[PDB]
């Protein structure tokens, strides 16, 4: 289960929000880098989760 936020992690506004598959964060497709022109088909891991994974490795 997961409880996702109602506002974009970048701009803090609501609307069409892509939900991260690994945390509660959500993002507008246009608030990502690069702005997404499609909704990913499979698993999508947000920038903050990507950073978290990286940090665990750099410390392990």
């Amino acid at each position: 289960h997961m409880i996702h936020e109602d506002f974009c992690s970048v701009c803090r506004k609501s609307g069409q929000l892509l939900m991260c598959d690994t945390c509660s964060r959500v993002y507008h497709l246009d608030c990502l880098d690069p702005p997404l022109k499609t909704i990913p088909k499979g698993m999508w891991i947000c920038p903050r989760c990507q950073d978290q994974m990286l940090k665990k490795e750099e410390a392990i």
């Binding site: 109602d6 609501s14 069409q16 929000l17 892509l18 939900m19 598959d21 990913p40 499979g42």
Partner: peptide
């Protein structure tokens, strides 16, 4: 991945 439509008030 999935999206949702949410409309918070202004």
């Amino acid at each position: 991945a999935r999206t949702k439509q949410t409309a918070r008030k202004s």
